[PDB]
Design a protein around this motif. Structure first.
Motif, PDB file in Angstrom:
ATOM      1  N   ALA A 177       9.986  24.263  -0.334  1.00 28.06           N
ATOM      2  CA  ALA A 177       8.746  24.033   0.486  1.00 28.06           C
ATOM      3  C   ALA A 177       7.524  24.975  -0.188  1.00 28.06           C
ATOM      4  O   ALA A 177       6.487  24.709   0.182  1.00 28.06           O
ATOM      5  CB  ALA A 177       8.903  24.394   2.005  1.00 28.06           C
ATOM      6  N   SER A 178       7.959  25.856  -1.027  1.00 23.50           N
ATOM      7  CA  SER A 178       7.032  26.812  -1.946  1.00 23.50           C
ATOM      8  C   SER A 178       7.933  27.400  -2.833  1.00 23.50           C
ATOM      9  O   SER A 178       9.058  27.436  -2.991  1.00 23.50           O
ATOM     10  CB  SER A 178       6.288  27.586  -0.927  1.00 23.50           C
ATOM     11  N   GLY A 179       6.963  27.976  -3.850  1.00 25.33           N
ATOM     12  CA  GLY A 179       7.586  28.571  -4.887  1.00 25.33           C
ATOM     13  C   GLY A 179       6.583  28.694  -6.022  1.00 25.33           C
ATOM     14  O   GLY A 179       5.546  28.115  -6.045  1.00 25.33           O
ATOM     15  N   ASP A 180       7.036  29.469  -7.002  1.00 23.64           N
ATOM     16  CA  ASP A 180       6.328  29.572  -8.299  1.00 23.64           C
ATOM     17  C   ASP A 180       5.844  28.329  -8.968  1.00 23.64           C
ATOM     18  O   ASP A 180       4.729  28.582  -9.524  1.00 23.64           O
ATOM     19  CB  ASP A 180       6.927  30.801  -9.233  1.00 23.64           C
ATOM     20  N   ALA A 181       6.467  27.574  -8.970  1.00 20.12           N
ATOM     21  CA  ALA A 181       6.265  26.198  -9.557  1.00 20.12           C
ATOM     22  C   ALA A 181       4.889  25.535  -8.807  1.00 20.12           C
ATOM     23  O   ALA A 181       4.336  24.669  -9.345  1.00 20.12           O
ATOM     24  CB  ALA A 181       7.425  25.167  -9.534  1.00 20.12           C
ATOM     25  N   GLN A 182       4.601  25.823  -7.656  1.00 22.25           N
ATOM     26  CA  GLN A 182       3.523  25.468  -6.994  1.00 22.25           C
ATOM     27  C   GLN A 182       3.591  23.817  -6.784  1.00 22.25           C
ATOM     28  O   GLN A 182       2.581  23.028  -7.045  1.00 22.25           O
ATOM     29  CB  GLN A 182       2.188  25.674  -7.711  1.00 22.25           C
ATOM     30  N   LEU A 183       4.677  23.425  -6.419  1.00 20.85           N
ATOM     31  CA  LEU A 183       5.084  22.050  -6.298  1.00 20.85           C
ATOM     32  C   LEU A 183       4.418  21.583  -5.040  1.00 20.85           C
ATOM     33  O   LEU A 183       3.716  20.451  -5.169  1.00 20.85           O
ATOM     34  CB  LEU A 183       6.490  21.855  -6.255  1.00 20.85           C
ATOM     35  N   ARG A 184       4.348  22.168  -4.023  1.00 25.27           N
ATOM     36  CA  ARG A 184       3.670  21.529  -2.910  1.00 25.27           C
ATOM     37  C   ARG A 184       1.901  21.589  -3.162  1.00 25.27           C
ATOM     38  O   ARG A 184       1.414  20.725  -2.590  1.00 25.27           O
ATOM     39  CB  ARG A 184       3.732  22.591  -1.763  1.00 25.27           C
ATOM     40  N   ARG A 185       1.389  22.534  -3.966  1.00 23.58           N
ATOM     41  CA  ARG A 185       0.062  22.501  -4.257  1.00 23.58           C
ATOM     42  C   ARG A 185      -0.223  21.286  -5.191  1.00 23.58           C
ATOM     43  O   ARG A 185      -1.152  20.778  -4.953  1.00 23.58           O
ATOM     44  CB  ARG A 185      -0.199  23.989  -5.036  1.00 23.58           C
ATOM     45  N   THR A 186       0.667  20.961  -6.085  1.00 22.81           N
ATOM     46  CA  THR A 186       0.284  19.681  -6.992  1.00 22.81           C
ATOM     47  C   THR A 186       0.308  18.452  -5.973  1.00 22.81           C
ATOM     48  O   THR A 186      -0.277  17.445  -6.211  1.00 22.81           O
ATOM     49  CB  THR A 186       1.423  19.664  -8.048  1.00 22.81           C
ATOM     50  N   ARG A 187       1.452  18.272  -5.108  1.00 22.23           N
ATOM     51  CA  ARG A 187       1.715  17.194  -4.184  1.00 22.23           C
ATOM     52  C   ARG A 187       0.644  16.995  -3.287  1.00 22.23           C
ATOM     53  O   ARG A 187       0.067  15.929  -2.879  1.00 22.23           O
ATOM     54  CB  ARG A 187       3.002  17.190  -3.713  1.00 22.23           C
ATOM     55  N   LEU A 188      -0.267  18.106  -2.985  1.00 25.44           N
ATOM     56  CA  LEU A 188      -1.105  18.162  -2.061  1.00 25.44           C
ATOM     57  C   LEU A 188      -2.374  17.489  -2.528  1.00 25.44           C
ATOM     58  O   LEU A 188      -3.172  16.597  -2.140  1.00 25.44           O
ATOM     59  CB  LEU A 188      -1.577  19.565  -1.426  1.00 25.44           C
ATOM     60  N   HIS A 189      -2.643  18.119  -3.990  1.00 24.13           N
ATOM     61  CA  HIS A 189      -3.863  17.686  -4.770  1.00 24.13           C
ATOM     62  C   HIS A 189      -3.620  15.827  -5.133  1.00 24.13           C
ATOM     63  O   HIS A 189      -4.683  15.470  -5.104  1.00 24.13           O
ATOM     64  CB  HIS A 189      -4.004  18.426  -6.097  1.00 24.13           C
ATOM     65  N   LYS A 190      -2.407  15.657  -5.245  1.00 20.97           N
ATOM     66  CA  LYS A 190      -2.198  14.194  -5.695  1.00 20.97           C
ATOM     67  C   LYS A 190      -2.423  13.253  -4.654  1.00 20.97           C
ATOM     68  O   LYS A 190      -2.886  12.202  -4.624  1.00 20.97           O
ATOM     69  CB  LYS A 190      -0.990  14.151  -6.409  1.00 20.97           C
ATOM     70  N   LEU A 191      -2.027  13.777  -3.202  1.00 20.69           N
ATOM     71  CA  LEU A 191      -1.801  13.144  -1.994  1.00 20.69           C
ATOM     72  C   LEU A 191      -3.625  12.933  -1.909  1.00 20.69           C
ATOM     73  O   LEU A 191      -3.755  11.685  -1.385  1.00 20.69           O
ATOM     74  CB  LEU A 191      -1.310  13.852  -1.084  1.00 20.69           C
ATOM     75  N   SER A 192      -4.232  13.796  -2.097  1.00 23.04           N
ATOM     76  CA  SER A 192      -5.679  13.755  -1.786  1.00 23.04           C
ATOM     77  C   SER A 192      -6.499  13.023  -2.924  1.00 23.04           C
ATOM     78  O   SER A 192      -7.139  11.784  -2.413  1.00 23.04           O
ATOM     79  CB  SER A 192      -6.214  15.043  -1.605  1.00 23.04           C
ATOM     80  N   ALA A 193      -6.002  13.232  -4.041  1.00 24.97           N
ATOM     81  CA  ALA A 193      -6.828  12.621  -5.124  1.00 24.97           C
ATOM     82  C   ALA A 193      -6.403  11.020  -5.226  1.00 24.97           C
ATOM     83  O   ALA A 193      -7.353  10.311  -5.369  1.00 24.97           O
ATOM     84  CB  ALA A 193      -6.521  12.990  -6.477  1.00 24.97           C
ATOM     85  N   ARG A 194      -5.148  10.867  -4.845  1.00 25.08           N
ATOM     86  CA  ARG A 194      -4.689   9.318  -4.815  1.00 25.08           C
ATOM     87  C   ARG A 194      -5.487   8.694  -3.580  1.00 25.08           C
ATOM     88  O   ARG A 194      -6.004   7.478  -3.695  1.00 25.08           O
ATOM     89  CB  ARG A 194      -3.294   9.070  -4.714  1.00 25.08           C
ATOM     90  N   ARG A 195      -5.730   9.355  -2.487  1.00 22.44           N
ATOM     91  CA  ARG A 195      -6.446   8.733  -1.287  1.00 22.44           C
ATOM     92  C   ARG A 195      -7.856   8.589  -1.662  1.00 22.44           C
ATOM     93  O   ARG A 195      -8.449   7.471  -1.747  1.00 22.44           O
ATOM     94  CB  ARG A 195      -6.468   9.732  -0.331  1.00 22.44           C
ATOM     95  N   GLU A 196      -8.551   9.600  -2.420  1.00 24.76           N
ATOM     96  CA  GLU A 196     -10.035   9.210  -2.656  1.00 24.76           C
ATOM     97  C   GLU A 196      -9.999   8.013  -3.731  1.00 24.76           C
ATOM     98  O   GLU A 196     -11.132   7.572  -3.775  1.00 24.76           O
ATOM     99  CB  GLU A 196     -10.411  10.715  -3.320  1.00 24.76           C
ATOM    100  N   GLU A 197      -9.103   7.867  -4.575  1.00 23.80           N
ATOM    101  CA  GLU A 197      -9.179   6.841  -5.463  1.00 23.80           C
ATOM    102  C   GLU A 197      -8.940   5.351  -4.843  1.00 23.80           C
ATOM    103  O   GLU A 197      -9.804   4.541  -5.314  1.00 23.80           O
ATOM    104  CB  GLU A 197      -7.969   7.049  -6.517  1.00 23.80           C
ATOM    105  N   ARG A 198      -8.241   5.357  -3.992  1.00 21.15           N
ATOM    106  CA  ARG A 198      -8.265   4.038  -3.222  1.00 21.15           C
ATOM    107  C   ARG A 198      -9.231   3.824  -2.141  1.00 21.15           C
ATOM    108  O   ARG A 198      -9.859   2.511  -2.095  1.00 21.15           O
ATOM    109  CB  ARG A 198      -6.704   3.926  -2.324  1.00 21.15           C
ATOM    110  N   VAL A 199      -9.945   4.973  -1.769  1.00 24.49           N
ATOM    111  CA  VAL A 199     -10.983   4.870  -0.877  1.00 24.49           C
ATOM    112  C   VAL A 199     -12.260   4.310  -1.802  1.00 24.49           C
ATOM    113  O   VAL A 199     -13.060   3.494  -1.339  1.00 24.49           O
ATOM    114  CB  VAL A 199     -11.074   6.133  -0.243  1.00 24.49           C
ATOM    115  N   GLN A 200     -12.285   5.098  -2.819  1.00 25.38           N
ATOM    116  CA  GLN A 200     -13.682   4.695  -3.712  1.00 25.38           C
ATOM    117  C   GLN A 200     -13.682   3.288  -4.296  1.00 25.38           C
ATOM    118  O   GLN A 200     -14.451   2.453  -4.139  1.00 25.38           O
ATOM    119  CB  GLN A 200     -13.677   5.471  -4.744  1.00 25.38           C
ATOM    120  N   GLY A 201     -12.112   2.944  -4.660  1.00 26.53           N
ATOM    121  CA  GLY A 201     -12.105   1.218  -4.844  1.00 26.53           C
ATOM    122  C   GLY A 201     -12.504   0.442  -3.815  1.00 26.53           C
ATOM    123  O   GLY A 201     -12.682  -0.687  -3.857  1.00 26.53           O
ATOM    124  N   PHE A 202     -11.834   0.921  -2.511  1.00 21.41           N
ATOM    125  CA  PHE A 202     -12.135   0.024  -1.474  1.00 21.41           C
ATOM    126  C   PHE A 202     -13.657  -0.195  -1.045  1.00 21.41           C
ATOM    127  O   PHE A 202     -14.129  -1.036  -0.527  1.00 21.41           O
ATOM    128  CB  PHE A 202     -11.540   0.519   0.044  1.00 21.41           C
TER     129      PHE A 202
END
Ligand SMILES: CC(C)=CCC/C(C)=C\CC/C(C)=C/CSP(=O)(O)OP(=O)(O)O
Ligand SMILES: CC(C)=CCC/C(C)=C\CC/C(C)=C/CSP(=O)(O)OP(=O)(O)O
Ligand SMILES: C=C(C)CCOP(=O)(O)OP(=O)(O)O
Ligand SMILES: C=C(C)CCOP(=O)(O)OP(=O)(O)O
Ligand SMILES: [Mg+2]
Ligand SMILES: [Mg+2]
Lengths: 202, 327, 327, 202
Positions: C288-313
């Motif tokens: 759920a957390s660690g130096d790899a910042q995995l959740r920080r990346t998945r949070l950015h991707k979850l948001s960026a992919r949302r904004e991308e579908r929204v802008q396309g819509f």
């Protein structure tokens, strides 16, 4: 056949030293620019070529742990060029190379303390059963040997959270930079470790 | 014969001291007093003479530190590994220790006039019972002094210290004072022998060895590491000065790294706690957020209850530690 | 006969305007032009005469707004519920609308010289086909003007607007341009008829009614509500001035509440996203957390992919909305 | 028997008005001090006493939603004193009283839009099947009637995110404060709602 000669030369270099590290640590403290992955990969490939079993790559910002694929790709690229069947090469580098960040130090000792205290709470262990050796076995190091040599690159006179528990007798040799590091420079550090005298408290 | 030399700094020492004191100064310096026997061989004296001069230099170096305003010092005086030396040398070291600690109690009150607190850290049950009683007296007498602090690591290793600290926390959960999930980096700090001092700013080892020999491994993870070739009985004010200079050149990057580490650990701890609150809230079938601020309350309670068990554990651990020192 | 009166402010109006313009001024005011028929009865005139004067006051009030620097106005001109009135009145209203929109196209170019953009919001398919074509012409002609903005709510209700907006987003997921989880308060904003204007600063209703009659319910959740007894055909500059004064007295608490709401919604959205990332990471068996910042990346991707579908819509929704307006 | 007379008087008051709200909303905008729960509870008990079926308590900071037990306790305390078997009294107040905050407005319309768009994605509904009535049924209001009267307390001329969808025809009566509110003041607002004329667009 040219690569076979280089393989012989590198193995003869490692065999010529009074002693060779079984586990080498590379601590990169330079924070001016992002580290040079091809320079790091070359240090790692030289370690494998001269006969060092395990190599741990460390930086306190976690850059290497967040760029693990880039580093391995660079290591595999240079290892193939020196050693002239990708899966076995990949598995070999994964068994020899470990990328570390601060959480592998103190945070892992804390993880082990939690695991042991959980056994106490289950009546499966007593607090008095945790001696120095049982704690060593609980760490994420498991069976791997502790680093006997650390090459510290950069201007910082600190280990910056590198395997605190495991560096109790590690020799710490310091070089000014990993950028454009030469094999002669790398081998001179090996000569320094070879010349060190370990008295173990006697 | 005493434990601190009474001498002011000469002109050049004073002058350079004033200069560096314009920049960041170390609050705590740790020494690995290495090289006594090699010094004895170089000067053609017996090894006990080397060790005896080694103690004299410790008393001299503490005066340099007090004159520099460095009011806390930790020294490696005897490793558990040093028990593997010959009985002749170990008895010689035990006798030197008996003699200085005995003179320390005779030179008491002079410890009041300077507020010097003496702490002796290690697995002290490995020492002779008589030397333990001399150590305990000195420690009990100089408690409640606060003008300066000397931590003598005797019969000590870092792995033994870290292991004992974990045993302490395990004792906590056994007694019901702790949950295993309360165990943390910060809590392990407070269970070390060194728990009443901050982490060293500088780690100095003499004699040219570039290893740490199981000394303050947890505590010096972000300390400035100074390996100096000089043999310990030959340490000068200028070796100490050079080491402080190293620390000042490292200070800006060392402090940023120290802070980035601390900030990252607190950030990750918050992520873990929020994820715990979320797991519990996913069970029970409650919402993960909303105007009721349910997760914000459960986060505060999860933390406050943790701090409450921790504070209770530490009070019991300090009562147990004062009890053994009283007997 | 035209849609905006050409008149400067008198001295006292000018003077008071300069005074209040030293404080926060509304950028957007919405009107519920209520009370026409009661005014007709009070003045002993036919109801069409009341409605006709009602339009004249709209043209007058827009000049007051332009002179006050309020460059966007929204008006309730015809509710879907108003279709339930007698055919005589509805035909009278449709005819008045046909006449003003027809004069609007004749008074074009005079719409260029002032950059006035005309938007007509509502379920316009309920209007006569001819009146739709007059509306579409006016809207198509005044597109790309940007000096001021008039939104005429004709055959409109708020519930019908909110329902259509949800149908739009449902169309998005049907087409594959949206995931149902992308639906948000901010996204529903952009699917309203009013999506090209900010939420009104002030909602004014005349005639003394203290209800909203299905007008801009979503948009005025944090608007200043001004209910004034005067009948709409009798609206004066000073009624408008009094309403702005109300807004200025409410502005500090209204703006804080607007911002606390926005800050709280973003905070809760972040908690929900972090909990989503945590659920996925609990599955797969990752930390759920660690130096790899995995959740920080998945949070950015979850948001960026949302904004991308929204802008396309939104690009597809705007292409579909321009297509119907073109035909 | 004294409480029976008061019960009669309150019911006779509600029955005497030209019309009575079925669902009353209380919007508290005062942010100077924390709201007076005993004042709010008294408004709620009067609503039940005069015959109003449902009461929604609202503040835009969510204070009432975060102090739900305090509010109910105060309501139950005053309701018992006026009505002279706690479970049935508790169940009755839970069926009549709803504590609201901003998330019950726009955020609930968004929740319903998500539920419908999820049905579209499952081929169980078409976007064209969402008319005004189906969306109304999807909201958290379910079968409960929309508020016909809102008493707005405080100096703010706004609804501040109170059931946007549900207040399309709600009458909005404003009082300066809920602190030390008198029954006469509360009943005068009911008289105002009773006197209002609703034309429904005709
Ligand atoms: C606190 C007190 C009263 C006395 C203790 C402090 C003193 C005087 C000596 C420390 C003992 C040792 C082993 C020091 C390491 S030097 P070494 O023996 O390793 O010499 P080498 O490194 O082999 O040259
Ligand atoms: C945009 C355009 C060209 C024309 C439309 C604007 C005009 C002139 C009139 C609006 C029509 C209505 C019903 C206004 C409500 S007043 P009411 O009828 O409810 O009177 P009452 O409230 O019963 O007294
Ligand atoms: C009291 C001290 C300074 C112990 C560490 O020095 P050692 O001499 O025992 O450590 P090694 O060099 O043998 O590793
Ligand atoms: C065009 C407008 C202003 C419609 C709203 O006024 P209504 O008169 O139709 O609303 P009610 O008073 O009937 O509720
Ligand atoms: Mg030594
Ligand atoms: Mg009307």
């Amino acid at each position: 056949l040219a690569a076979a000669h280089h393989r012989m030369r590198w193995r003869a270099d490692g065999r010529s030293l009074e002693k060779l590290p079984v586990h080498m640590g590379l601590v990169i403290t330079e924070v001016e620019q992002e580290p040079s992955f091809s320079d790091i990969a070359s240090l790692v490939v030289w370690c494998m070529a001269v006969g060092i079993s395990y190599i741990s790559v460390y930086d306190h910002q976690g850059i290497f742990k967040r760029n693990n694929s880039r580093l391995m790709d660079e290591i595999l690229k240079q290892q193939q060029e020196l050693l002239g069947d990708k899966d076995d090469q990949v598995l070999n580098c994964h068994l020899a190379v470990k990328v570390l960040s601060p959480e592998d130090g103190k945070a892992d000792i804390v993880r082990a303390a939690q695991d042991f205290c959980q056994l106490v709470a289950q009546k499966q262990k007593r607090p008095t059963d945790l001696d120095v050796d049982t704690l060593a076995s609980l760490l994420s190091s498991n069976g791997c040997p502790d680093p006997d040599l650390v090459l510290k690159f950069g201007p910082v006179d600190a280990t910056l959270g590198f395997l605190p528990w495991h560096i109790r007798l590690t020799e710490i040799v310091s070089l000014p930079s990993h950028l454009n590091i030469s094999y002669e420079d790398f081998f001179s550090a090996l000569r320094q470790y070879a010349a060190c005298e370990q008295r173990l408290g006697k | 014969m005493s434990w601190i030399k009474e001498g002011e700094l000469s002109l050049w020492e004073r002058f350079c001291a004033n200069i560096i004191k314009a920049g960041p100064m170390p609050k705590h310096i740790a020494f690995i007093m290495d090289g006594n026997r090699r010094y004895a061989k170089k000067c053609q004296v017996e090894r006990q003479e080397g060790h005896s001069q080694g103690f004299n230099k410790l008393a001299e170096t503490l005066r340099w530190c007090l004159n520099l305003g460095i009011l806390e010092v930790t020294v490696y005086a005897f490793s558990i590994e040093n028990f593997k030396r010959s009985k002749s040398e170990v008895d010689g070291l035990m006798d030197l220790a008996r003699q200085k600690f005995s003179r320390l109690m005779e030179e008491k009150e002079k410890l009041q006039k300077h507020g010097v607190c003496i702490r002796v850290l290690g697995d002290l049950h490995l020492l002779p019972l008589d030397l333990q009683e001399l150590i305990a007296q000195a420690v009990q007498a100089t408690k409640n002094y606060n003008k300066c602090f000397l931590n003598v690591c005797f019969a000590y290793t870092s792995r033994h210290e870290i292991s004992n600290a974990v045993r302490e926390m395990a004792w906590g959960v056994e007694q019901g004072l702790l949950d295993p999930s309360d165990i943390s980096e910060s809590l392990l700090d407070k269970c070390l022998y060194t728990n009443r001092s901050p982490h060293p700013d500088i780690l100095i080892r003499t004699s040219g060895e570039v290893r740490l020999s199981d000394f303050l491994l947890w505590q010096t993870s972000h300390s400035c590491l100074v390996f100096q070739p000089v043999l310990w009985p030959e340490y000068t004010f200028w070796n100490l000065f050079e080491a402080i200079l190293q620390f000042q050149m490292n200070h800006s990057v060392l402090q940023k790294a120290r802070d980035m580490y601390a900030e990252e650990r607190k950030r990750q701890q918050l992520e873990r706690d929020q994820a715990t609150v979320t797991e519990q809230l996913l069970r029970e079938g409650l919402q993960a957020s909303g105007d009721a601020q349910l997760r914000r309350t459960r986060l505060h309670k999860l933390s406050a209850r943790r701090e409450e068990r921790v504070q209770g554990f530490l009070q019991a651990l300090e009562l147990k530690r004062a009890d053994w020192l009283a007997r």
